[PDB]
């Protein structure tokens, strides 16, 4: 039964990278400020000039707003080497807001690219009244959702301060006889119903939605071929390298890779850099979907001006 | 999805409390900054690298006997 | 043969300090915890201080808090105590012990296995 | 912080059993120690944890827990362990110990 020890030395440049990832941070939230903002103005106000303004887009902006309107919180926690001077009450409320507001943004964007083909095929000849109602009621529905997966994470967490470092945190505090079963359940609720079963959606109905113009004639002259490839391929580039970097992480914690203090500093620095990476999807959805349509641009620009 | 700075970086998180020293083949002690001092283990069945809680008394005793040399 | 001597203990000044030094043998320094503790005359124990050898964590007591400072040497297995702006009230005898900072997943063990013998400190004029 | 232990002395004898209370003001997760300091000696180290004792420690020292009341039982006393016994909490970054219980002889 042989023993042997490891000791983890100090990291010299956390103060670097967390440093420079306020630097990134920072930007994010101005620009996903002004553009979510701007993009619920123009929706919100379109309504007056006629246009059927899609209530995706504006649940979609709205709930890009919340997740981006948290990043101070988590920008002061962050200079502080990841300590909680704030709070238990702070932790579990900012938490709660930022899960449920980015679960429904995912949500809203399986949403719409499931409505663009029903649209185009199944949807072209019911009235205005009842294409409305039925986008109500889901958009009630998949506000629920969001709501309840987003509970049970923040029911359990609870601020504490360590014993020896003399420092506070904010961490979950599962079940002492199911830690184990809880942290790994979440995490397939964060990877299924986070990026698995969305993006194998979206990917299905945007290729079916492809298809479906090149069979016709008179739209493909109107519409743009790469730019429905173009919205797959920002998300698949925005969220799987977090996806990827929490899956290694879980690796980790069951002892599937041997333990080094360089594995430590790799796995820290990426799942930080790639949280940023990430939150960069609420600043550029209102691009992606607003900014690039002419009707938009025409009536955002009527609007500045 | 949380965010990581509500997560706890430690190379454990979790224990176990049914290990016995008759399956046992190799400890080892991480001294951690955030973390302070943790175990690990090695069994000889399933040869995989499950954590060990320290309230168990003969780990606590042996892993301060070794410390010691 | 784990071993704590304090050395750097007499008479003394109010006003002025001493320089209390702990050394360590027989034991894998980096790899605990050093904690300060007080006894005043014919009286009960008290903790003062203590301090993390590997990374330097360091706590205080209210009564001591900002007019002692620990340092550590991995090096020699040094504890230093420089204890300034003494009172005739600091008067005790001062020990110096060890613990092994283990993770529970609510607390971290705190029991001090080891104490040294201690030194005795005077204040007055 | 405050940890009140009682009785503030105690009396005994040899093949008899002695208990000695420890209270919080708040709630500490069976994070306590019980230690002996002799006439003039550096104390020892009797119980960890809530109770678990020590390597060398004797059988018949024990710890008990009830919420914030943790409970040391010493049973067939022998005439050696007579001195001040002192109750620790280390939950909490400062720590903080029981003012004594000198068991003495009837």
């Known amino acids: 039964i042989v023993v042997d020890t490891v000791m983890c030395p100090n990291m010299p440049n956390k103060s670097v990278l967390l440093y420079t990832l306020s630097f990134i941070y920072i930007f994010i939230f101005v620009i996903g400020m002004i553009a979510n903002s701007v993009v619920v103005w123009v929706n919100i106000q379109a309504k007056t000039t006629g246009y059927d303004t899609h209530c995706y887009i504006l649940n979609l902006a709205i709930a890009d707003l919340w997740v981006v309107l948290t990043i101070p919180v988590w920008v002061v926690s962050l200079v502080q080497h990841n300590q909680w001077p704030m709070g238990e009450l702070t932790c579990k409320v900012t938490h709660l807001i930022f899960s449920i507001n980015l679960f429904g943004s995912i949500f809203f964007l399986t949403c719409m690219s499931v409505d663009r083909y029903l649209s185009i095929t199944y949807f072209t000849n019911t009235p205005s009244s009842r294409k409305k109602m039925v986008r109500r009621v889901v958009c009630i529905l998949v506000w629920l959702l969001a709501f309840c997966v987003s509970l049970p994470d923040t029911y359990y967490l609870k601020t504490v301060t360590s014993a020896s470092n003399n420092e506070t945190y904010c961490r979950s505090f599962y079940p002492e006889h199911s830690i184990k079963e809880w942290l790994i359940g979440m995490e397939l609720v964060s990877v299924v119903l986070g990026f698995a079963v969305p993006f194998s959606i979206i990917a299905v109905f945007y290729f079916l939605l492809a298809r479906a113009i090149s069979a016709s004639s008179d739209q493909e002259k109107h519409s743009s071929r790469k730019i429905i490839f173009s919205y797959v391929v920002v998300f698949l580039v925005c969220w799987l390298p977090y996806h990827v970097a929490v899956l290694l992480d879980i690796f980790s914690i069951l002892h599937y890779i041997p333990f080094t203090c360089r594995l430590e500093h790799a796995l820290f620095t990426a799942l930080h850099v790639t949280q940023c990476l990430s939150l960069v999807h609420c600043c550029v959805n209102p691009v992606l979907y607003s900014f690039i349509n002419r009707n938009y641009r025409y009536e955002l620009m009527k609007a500045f001006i | 999805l949380r965010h990581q700075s509500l997560s706890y970086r430690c190379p454990c998180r979790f224990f176990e409390s049914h290990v016995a020293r008759a399956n046992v083949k190799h400890l080892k002690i991480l001294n951690t900054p955030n973390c302070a001092l943790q175990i690990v283990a090695r069994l000889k069945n399933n040869n995989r690298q499950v954590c060990i809680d320290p309230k168990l008394k003969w780990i606590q005793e042996y892993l301060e006997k070794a410390l010691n040399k | 043969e784990v071993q704590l001597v304090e050395s750097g203990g007499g008479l003394v000044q109010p006003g002025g300090s001493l320089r209390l030094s702990c050394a360590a043998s027989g034991f894998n320094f980096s790899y605990s915890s050093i904690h300060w503790v007080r006894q005043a005359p014919g009286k009960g124990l008290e903790w003062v201080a203590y301090?993390?050898?590997?990374?330097?964590?360091?706590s205080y007591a209210d009564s001591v808090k900002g007019r002692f400072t620990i340092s550590a040497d991995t090096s020699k297995n040094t504890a230093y105590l420089q204890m300034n702006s003494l009172r005739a009230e600091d008067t005790a005898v001062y020990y110096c012990?060890?613990?092994?900072?283990?993770?529970?997943?609510?607390?971290?063990?705190?029991?001090?296995?080891?104490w040294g013998q201690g030194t005795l400190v005077t204040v007055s004029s | 912080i405050q940890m009140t232990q009682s009785p503030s002395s105690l009396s005994a004898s040899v093949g008899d059993r002695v208990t000695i209370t420890c209270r919080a003001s708040?709630?500490?997760?069976?994070?306590v120690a019980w230690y002996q300091q002799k006439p003039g000696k550096a104390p020892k180290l009797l119980i960890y944890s809530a109770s678990s004792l020590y390597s060398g420690v004797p059988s018949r020292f024990s710890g008990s827990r009830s919420g914030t009341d943790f409970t040391l039982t010493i049973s067939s006393l022998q005439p050696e362990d007579f001195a001040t016994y002192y109750c620790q909490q280390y939950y909490y970054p400062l720590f903080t110990f029981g003012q004594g219980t000198k068991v003495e002889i009837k």
């Open positions: 012990a060890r613990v092994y900072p283990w993770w529970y997943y609510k607390y971290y063990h705190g029991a001090l296995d080891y």
């Open positions: 708040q709630s500490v997760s069976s994070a």
């Open positions: 301090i993390y050898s590997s990374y330097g964590y360091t």
